[PDB]
Each structure stands twice: as C-alpha cells, then as structure tokens.
Design a protein around this ligand. Structure first.
Ligand SMILES: NC(=O)c1ccc[n+]([C@@H]2O[C@H](COP(=O)([O-])OP(=O)(O)OC[C@H]3O[C@@H](n4cnc5c(N)ncnc54)[C@H](O)[C@@H]3O)[C@@H](O)[C@H]2O)c1
Ligand SMILES: NC(=O)c1ccc[n+]([C@@H]2O[C@H](COP(=O)([O-])OP(=O)(O)OC[C@H]3O[C@@H](n4cnc5c(N)ncnc54)[C@H](O)[C@@H]3O)[C@@H](O)[C@H]2O)c1
Ligand SMILES: NC(=O)c1ccc[n+]([C@@H]2O[C@H](COP(=O)([O-])OP(=O)(O)OC[C@H]3O[C@@H](n4cnc5c(N)ncnc54)[C@H](O)[C@@H]3O)[C@@H](O)[C@H]2O)c1
Ligand SMILES: NC(=O)c1ccc[n+]([C@@H]2O[C@H](COP(=O)([O-])OP(=O)(O)OC[C@H]3O[C@@H](n4cnc5c(N)ncnc54)[C@H](O)[C@@H]3O)[C@@H](O)[C@H]2O)c1
Ligand SMILES: O=C(O)/C=C/c1cccc(C(F)(F)F)c1
Ligand SMILES: O=C(O)/C=C/c1cccc(C(F)(F)F)c1
Ligand SMILES: O=C(O)/C=C/c1cccc(C(F)(F)F)c1
Ligand SMILES: O=C(O)/C=C/c1cccc(C(F)(F)F)c1
Lengths: 267, 267, 267, 267
C-alpha cells in the first residue's frame, strides 16, 4: 500500500459525498491508519464513517473552538497510543455563509459573515498545523483542499477570497512545518458534486447563481485535456494520498492541481 | 496636467511619509481636484495635508465604521457639489495588529487580530467601492495599494495573507465596477520607508523581524534592474496617477508592479 | 502631450489595421517625434504611413537580416540628427508560418518553420534592444506586443510558444536595459481584428481554426469586466503610450494587460 | 512497487550524475521495465547504464535527427515486444550552446545557437510525444524536466528562454496526449550538481557566471522550507516516478515543483 503504516488524521467528513470521505477511503485502501475529526453532528458522522473500509476513532473538532484545538493533540495521542505520532494531516474544511456566495451581491456580504468564512476556510489551516505539528513525525505531510482562486468567477464570491487567503496561509505553514521536517501543500480540485454543490445547482442560493455554477462546471470538462468528472472524487482523493506519501518529498508550500488540466487551458 | 479636471478621493494619509500623501501631491500637481479621507486623528491629518500644493476637503472615514461608510457618498457630494461625481478613488489603507507581524510567531496571532487586519486591509476595498461607485463617472478608476504576496516572506506574516485576500477582492470589485464603466486595479509597490516601516527596521517589533525587513529591502534594490529607492515614494505615486488617468483604459481587475522590476528577477 | 519632445522608434506597420499604426498615430497625437521601421514592402508601408498625423522617416528593417540590425543605430541617428538619441522603442513584430498556426496539427509544424517564427517574434526583441540601447537616453522605454500565453488555446499553437519565449526574453532585456536607465515591458493585448486575423476568422487557415478563433474572441468580451472591442486598437495604443511616458517609471521586465480585464476572470 | 508492470522510456542519460540516471534507477527499484534512449556516445552510455539495478535496452535518439524520430516507435516496439505499448515517457534532454549561457553577454548569442538550444530543449518535447503517443497505453504519462523560468536569473540566459518555451509546449502536448488518455507534465527541479553544472561552478563558462551560479544555489537551500540538497537527485527522481504512477491521475499540462519549496518563498 502507498501509505502502509502511516498514521493520518482526516478532517472534514460530513456526508458520503464529502471529498474527505473519499480521501479517507483511499488512504485506508492504501494501508493508512486513520484518526477522523468531525464537526457538530458527531452522531451522523459516525454513522457515515461506519461505511469506510476500516474502523477509525472519531474526535470532535470545531476549528472555531479554541478549547477543541488546545486539547486536540492530546486526544489524538490518546487515540493512536502514547509514543506514536502522526505522519499525515488532511484539512478538508470549508464554509462561507450564504451571504458571501450565491446571488446575494458581492457587496452585500457583511464582514461578520466573511470573517467567519475566512476563519473556518483559511485561518483554521494554520490552527490545525499549530495543534498537530508537535505530534508529527519528520517526513510528515499536511494537505489542505483548495479551489483555484487566481481569477474571479461568478457566485463563488467571498469563498474565492477565502481560498486566496488559504493559499497564502499554506506558504507560511510550510515555513513552520519545515522546522519539523514536515511538508505542507494544497490540492486544488476541480468542481465536485457534493450535497451542498448539487443543492446550489438546484437553486438553493438563487436561480442565477445556480445557472452560473452549472456553466462553470460544463466549461471545466470542456477545457480539461483529459476531461473532468464532477461526480467522481476518486482522482482528487488519490492526489491527496500522493502528497501524503513519500513520493513528493521535495514539494512544499505548493499547490497541486487535480482538475483535469483545466487551469492550463484557455478554451 | 495628466489628471486635469478629474475629481479624485484619496484615503490613507496619516503622516508626510504616507504613500497616500505623495499620491495626493502628484495628483494635485497634475491638475486633479481632491477630496481626502482620514482616520481617527483628523486634527493631525489636517495639519499634515496643509502642506499639499492645494487645499482639499478632509472627511472622516473609519472603514470599520458602517455609519461612516453609509454616509460617505453624501459627504463627498456635499464637498464636490451636487451634480458632480468622482472620477477616481484611491485606497491606501492597511493595518495588521503587531501579533500578526514581527517576531511574534505566525501561529501565535489570535484570529480576532487577523480578522481586524483583513477587515481594514482587504474587505474595506470592497466597502469603499460599494460606497463610492454610485457617485463615480463612467471612465472612472479605483486604485488600491498592494505588496506582492505571491511568495511568503519573513515578518510580513498575516499582512501577506491580507494582501493575498486584497488581490482576490480587487478582481471581484472589477466585476462590479465594470457595470459603472469604472476600472479597479492595485499598485504593488516595493518597500517604502514610512514612519511605521522605519520603526520596525529599528526594532519596534523585535530585533529579528527588524533584521529580516532590512535584508528584504536590500535584496529589492539588488534585484530591480532599474534599482529601487525605498526613501522615494514618488515613482509609486506616479504609477497610481497613471492608473487614475485615461491612459490605461483597458486594464482592470489587475495589478501593476511599481517595484523597480524586482519581482521579475530571481537574483 | 503625454509624449511631448520624445523621440520614439515604431516598428511593425504593414497596413492601416496594424496595432503599430495606431500606436504611431496616438504617439504623434501626444507630441512624439517618430522614426518608423518597415519590412519588405517599403513602398506600400510609405503609402500607409502617409495617413499618420505627421510625417516620419521610414527605415527598412528585416529583423532576420544581421546587416539591417548592424546599421540600424546609424540610420536612426542620421534620421533624428547627430547628438540626439531615442527615448522610446516599440517592437510590434510577429510572424509564425501557417504550419505553426491554424488547423494544421500542432505536431506537424517542422522545426524550421517554428524557428523562423521564434526568430521574428521573440529573439528579435533582444536583437532590437541590442541595436538601439546604445542610442537611447536614460529614462527611455522599450515596449513589445504580447498575447497572454500562460494557458494553451486552440489554433494559436506555436505562436503561443513564441509569446512564452518573448515574455522570458523581455525579462532578460530589462536586465540589460537597466544599465542604460531604460525600462523594458510588454503589453499583452486582447484580440484585435487586423487584416491577418480577419482572414483567419474567414477560414484562411482552415474552417475549424477559424471557428476556434471566433469563439475565443467572443469569450473575451464576455469575460472582460469592462468589455473588449476587437475592432478598436486605440485602448492598446494608449497603453503602449503609457509605458513610453514617464508615468510608469518603476515598472520593468513586466507585462501590462490591455485586454479589458479578461485574463483576471474565469467566466 | 509504485510502477510495477509499467513499461517506461527514459531519455537523457549521459553520466552517472544525470538526473535521468536517477529517474531510471528509482523507476526500476519500483518495478518498471525500462527502455533507454541515448545521444551520440552510445558506448559510453551503455557502460554507464550497466550500473542500473536491471538491464534495459538502449536505443539511439538524436532529437534533431528526423530519421531517428521517424523510426523510434518501431524500434521501441521491437524492444518491448509486439502488442506491448509504453505506459510512460521521460524527457530529460537539454542543451544550450555556451554562447547562450555563462559570462558571454545575453545579447551576444547568435540566433543559430539559440535555435539549436530551443530545438533540443523545447521543441523536442513535442517531437518525442508525436513519435511515442501512438504506442502509448491509455492512462499513460509523459514527463519532462524543467527549471522554473518565471523570473530571469544571471547566467542561465537563453536556457531560461528555452524553459519558458518548454512550459508552453507542455501545455499543448497535454491537449494532444489527452486524446490518447495520456497525461503530460513537467517537473521543475531545484539545481542539481551534474558534471556540467559542477564544471560551470568551477569556472568553465567564465568566473562571474560561476560565481553567479554558486550564489543562486546557496539561496535555494536558504529559501526552501525543507532545505535543498543539490548533491542528491533522488527527491527529483521520486517526483518523476510519482507523475509516472497512477497517483496523480487528474493532473496534466502542469508543472510539479521538486525544489524544496524554494519557489514559494521570497527570502
Ligand atoms: N466540492 C468542490 O467542488 C470543491 C472543490 C475544491 C475544493 N473543495 C474544498 O474541499 C473542502 C471540503 O469540502 P467538500 O466539498 O467536501 O464539502 P463538505 O461539505 O462535504 O465538507 C465541508 C466540511 O467542512 C466542515 N466544517 C465546516 N465548518 C467547520 C468547523 N467550524 N469546524 C470543522 N469543520 C467544519 C464540514 O463539517 C464539513 O465536513 C473544502 O475546503 C472545499 O472548499 C471543494
Ligand atoms: N510602505 C510600504 O512599504 C508599502 C508597500 C506596498 C504597499 N503598501 C501599502 O500601501 C498602503 C498605505 O500604507 P503606508 O505605507 O503608506 O503606511 P501608512 O501608515 O502611512 O498608511 C496607512 C493608512 O491606513 C490607514 N488606516 C488604518 N486603519 C484605518 C481605518 N480603520 N480606516 C481608515 N484608515 C485606516 C492609516 O490611518 C493610515 O492613513 C497600505 O495598504 C500598505 O499596505 C505599503
Ligand atoms: N492582432 C492581435 O490580436 C494581437 C494581440 C496581441 C498581440 N499582438 C501582437 O502584436 C504584434 C503586431 O501584430 P499585428 O497584430 O498588428 O499584425 P500585423 O500583421 O499588422 O503586424 C505584423 C508586423 O510584423 C512585421 N514583421 C514580420 N516579419 C518581420 C520581419 N522579418 N522583420 C520585421 N518585421 C516583420 C510585419 O511586417 C508587420 O508589420 C505582434 O507581435 C502580434 O503578435 C497581436
Ligand atoms: N541540473 C539541474 O540543475 C537541472 C535542474 C532542472 C532541470 N534540469 C533539466 O533536467 C534535464 C536533464 O539534464 P541534466 O541535468 O541531467 O544534465 P545532463 O547533461 O546529464 O543531461 C542532458 C542530456 O541531454 C541530452 N541531449 C543533449 N542533446 C541531445 C540530443 N540532440 N538528443 C538527445 N539528447 C540530447 C544529453 O545527451 C544528456 O543525456 C535537462 O532538461 C535539464 O535542463 C536540470
Ligand atoms: O469550495 C467549495 O466548497 C466549492 C467548490 C465548487 C464546486 C462547484 C462549483 C464551483 C464554482 F464556483 F466554480 F462553480 C465551486
Ligand atoms: O504593507 C505595508 O504596509 C508594508 C510593506 C513593507 C515595507 C517594507 C518592508 C516590507 C517587507 F515585509 F517586505 F520587509 C513590507
Ligand atoms: O499575435 C497575433 O498576431 C494574434 C493574436 C490573436 C488575435 C485574434 C485571436 C487570437 C486567438 F488565437 F486567441 F484566437 C490571437
Ligand atoms: O537546466 C539545466 O541543465 C541547469 C539547471 C541549473 C543548475 C544549477 C544552477 C542553475 C542556475 F542557473 F540557477 F544557477 C541552473
């Protein structure tokens, strides 16, 4: 297995369509021993993760809760055993209030809403690294999930801004992680039909935002030289596992694009 | 004059070494009629701006104050006269609490501090555009001040993250401003010895942060094919005036580098 | 005038739809004294440039002719008078054999054809700088024409590769030009309906290449927050004049996008 | 093994310090069956590759020889057996005449020399893809070697321009390769002390070019958050193997940086 013997923490599972669910599945298929973290609905998350190939301890983590973060390392060590450390950390956490996405005009999002989204989607990447680097082995790897924000797009709005901040945060986390012999990188995925994404395309945030997202998705498969299947998160999961392995040992502070090549093509 | 007849709002003057002071001076030398905005110390700012070549009305603007923003357009129209609109807006506003810069470790900045810095340094670019676009003429231009955040650097820390967010915000403001026939762009300046910057180099945020900033400044002049004079903000001011003029009419959502060419060179 | 008193060489006029024709027109409107260079059809070019607002000497320059380049500085000094130097140089030269563009497959262009296109479109930017920098004044400016090659696109094919090379060449020319106090920059224009471009859209290089170019053009105006008029080269000409002026004095080795903002937007 | 059962062609071995030698070693350690290609000194190359963990057929390939390219697919199929196809292709080929590198001024390289370097270092990536894609399996992968050319640097000179062209070529090769279900990507390596590189640092291309290269190398390890060992090509080889594997299945037209993270950091 690509990850045989590695101990890896995976955040961000909420449904069976979560990108993190497929990261966890593939990592377990490749021999990794997982610790999972979940937010708010731990009963639901436990029922979801019961469908993974192997059992994994589930710990509560609200990345806005300073007490959850202060205790996280101790709770992880309790789960994997004293004297054992983590080899991998997966950040698959994102949120932006609906005022900062959708048909609500970009100018109408209040800063309280934007700040909450930047807290959860960008600052928390630094928060998790701060908490977990002291229990990470040399040669370890931290990976977060990104959506290419280098150009503006309709509807994504403030979530795009949060991803631009996350990319900048990743470059500073790499500086800190390097002192531990640990890499830090993001995977910029193409669009994936999660429950939330399908709801938006169905009009949950207004009709025009739904129409814009659908047009965005269609251009992606058209641009990608190898195509793009928004219903299949497995290529994204494999790319995360690649970064968690020892096979990209000189890459850090960086972004790997698991997007079909779409960002390399204009039309 | 390059800006003859144009009515331009300039934020961000606090001392005579403020980049915005030199923007205002050059704009007035080029025939623009200015409205100035200042934060908190309006008595001091008035005394400072008395040294500009021409008198200009000064309005109070704390970009974190929703009431200041809601009234800003009316106060500007009162200053320039009913029936007159703005042709230009200059955002020269930035702040990050010292916990997010300097020798305080990157991981030790609390999110309340980071959020305040992102509010003032990035979100407020959208806030000012929201307030002023309804009183801007077609062909108008909004310009904000940037510091290239595409790579991490020592000490800048969370302020770098805020600039990454600002660049993303600028691309969305351009979408909105375009409906008004208005351009939105940033000027990414090289380092300029403002009062705050000189204090940091003198050790105000710790000795190692001061040493890192000084090394950063020295490499800049070395890399710049035409050199870089951190004691001279006039080239930055002229570049802002270029974007405020009619001579870059097909550039928007973009970044112009007034940095000596340093960002185009590795060594 | 923006360029009053400046002596500026402009290459690349071949028809009245040439981007360089509009650069020359606007520069003369702004008070510049021009020297023109033309390739192969000097009788035709003279008849074309007779329609410019002011007379200008026309010199023959085939950038593949080492003898033309070796004599160019002397012929320019003879035209503007001994003791006078150039303040500006405009490179508006590009060519790629049809085997390297159009419906002919990317893999089918022979290297002899590609090499000729890279010679004319990229290496010659260095060739002209080598020839003219010794007769350029401090504070001078060299500008070349670019088409954003950061992503692949249909039909442009090897010409895209040549533009990627040109952008790299520009960064090295800036290093050399800086020793003379001269800036070097490119303007990346949106698509402009020159005679050659209209012929391609009409099917001169095959129907599918024509269809691809037309779709490329349409997406450009759609993406540009301020729109894009491919029939109007005047915004591109003004941006070149901006770089030729003294109003971007700290920008070199760089690229200014005169494209409506289209490259800052995904959809 | 990461590459068990895969049939992979590796070009570019000339000494035991060649990056391609270490690519081949690691690929064989990971179970790949190799076909090697060599240029000009096949007796020497055979003696060198005798030290690889497994025997591999060696075929002559001068990428400037149209007859070598026209026959290459048939010679590969003869080596791996009829009915078998390649799963991987490694382009590790580069050359620029000394007039285009070193202390010889950038402006003094004749175009004949530059054109030869661009032929070997950039066009040949398309040439090899044209030759080998018809005998490549779906899910296959083409990888070429890159050195980040996004900023100019001393001494690299025209070789930097060639790498900028190669990056553009890679994006078009991905378009073609996608029709075969094949990915195309580059690995941008940090500096590696090959025989040629050590000779340049020793002054083979002039003293100042040697001094500039040494300073470039030292800044690299300083910038890299995980450090950079120019004497160890193994991290670069592993990254190439990662791209040759099935673990980056949604990445194409792209660049993976195996450089210690140095390109993500300013100082
Ligand atoms: N779906 C896409 O198209 C796409 C593309 C690229 C990147 N991404 C990114 O991938 C990440 C995962 O998102 P997803 O698509 O799988 O959707 P998701 O809804 O399945 O996952 C979001 C996760 O964030 C977690 N979360 C929210 N608030 C939290 C908090 N306070 N503390 C801890 N966790 C919290 C959710 O509980 C949930 O598990 C996100 O960063 C997302 O931006 C998604
Ligand atoms: N000095 C440099 O080296 C440099 C380089 C590039 C960009 N910049 C940017 O240029 C901008 C101007 O900074 P400066 O260098 O001239 O320093 P400065 O201190 O002179 O200007 C900062 C300005 O921000 C204003 N400000 C702070 N909080 C505010 C608030 N709540 N509301 C309104 N205004 C507020 C200050 O009052 C002050 O006028 C900043 O965005 C800065 O990041 C500076
Ligand atoms: N038209 C567009 O859409 C567009 C967009 C961006 C950039 N550009 C660039 O702008 C430049 C000008 O092109 P244009 O669009 O105006 O088309 P054009 O055909 O009008 O200009 C091309 C010029 O190149 C010159 N030229 C060709 N071979 C030459 C040689 N051996 N020596 C000297 N000159 C030679 C032609 O004679 C001609 O004057 C080109 O670099 C082009 O790539 C064009
Ligand atoms: N050494 C570094 O620091 C470094 C860094 C990044 C990338 N690279 C790239 O890695 C690649 C491999 O270079 P290297 O460092 O290992 O040096 P090298 O000298 O070992 O390899 C160069 C190879 O190019 C081959 N070659 C030259 N002309 C050829 C031709 N006409 N046909 C076929 N092959 C030809 C040589 O025979 C030789 O095998 C190059 O593309 C190089 O630019 C090197
Ligand atoms: O980060 C996230 O959770 C969302 C990612 C995403 C998914 C589908 C479409 C888009 C769009 F905005 F590009 F349309 C974005
Ligand atoms: O945005 C600001 O106000 C500060 C900009 C700045 C000034 C001098 C040095 C640096 C450094 F961080 F690069 F060193 C940054
Ligand atoms: O450089 C040139 O002369 C051509 C530029 C150009 C003009 C119109 C369309 C396109 C396209 F390839 F994007 F379609 C390119
Ligand atoms: O591509 C190549 O073969 C050379 C790559 C290389 C190796 C060492 C140093 C440098 C420098 F130019 F950055 F110094 C480049």
């Amino acid at each position: 297995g690509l990850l045989d013997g590695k101990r890896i923490l995976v955040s961000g599972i909420i449904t069976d369509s979560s990108i993190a669910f497929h990261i966890a599945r593939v990592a377990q298929e490749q021999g990794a021993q997982l610790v999972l973290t979940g937010f708010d609905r731990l009963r639901l998350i436990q029922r979801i993760t019961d469908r993974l190939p192997a059992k994994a301890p589930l710990l509560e983590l609200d990345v806005q809760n300073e007490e959850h973060l202060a205790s996280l390392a101790g709770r992880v060590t309790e789960a994997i055993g004293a004297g054992n450390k983590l080899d991998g950390v997966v950040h698959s956490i994102g949120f932006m209030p609906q005022t900062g996405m959708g048909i609500n005009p970009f100018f109408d999002a209040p800063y309280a809403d934007v700040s909450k989204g930047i807290h959860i989607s960008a600052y928390s990447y630094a928060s998790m690294a701060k908490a977990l680097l002291p229990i990470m082995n040399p040669g370890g790897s931290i990976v977060g999930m990104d959506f290419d924000p280098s150009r503006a797009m309709p509807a994504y709005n403030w979530m795009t801004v949060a991803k631009s901040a996350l990319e900048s945060v990743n470059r500073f986390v790499a500086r800190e992680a390097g002192k531990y012999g640990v890499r830090s990188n993001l995977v910029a995925a193409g669009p994936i039909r999660t429950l939330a994404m399908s709801a938006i395309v169905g009009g949950a945030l207004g009709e025009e935002a739904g129409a814009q997202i659908q047009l965005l998705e269609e251009g992606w498969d058209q641009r990608a030289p190898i195509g793009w299947n928004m219903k299949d998160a497995t290529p994204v999961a494999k790319t995360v596992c690649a970064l968690l392995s020892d096979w990209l040992p000189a890459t850090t502070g960086d972004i790997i694009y698991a997007d079909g090549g779409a960002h390399t093509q204009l039309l």
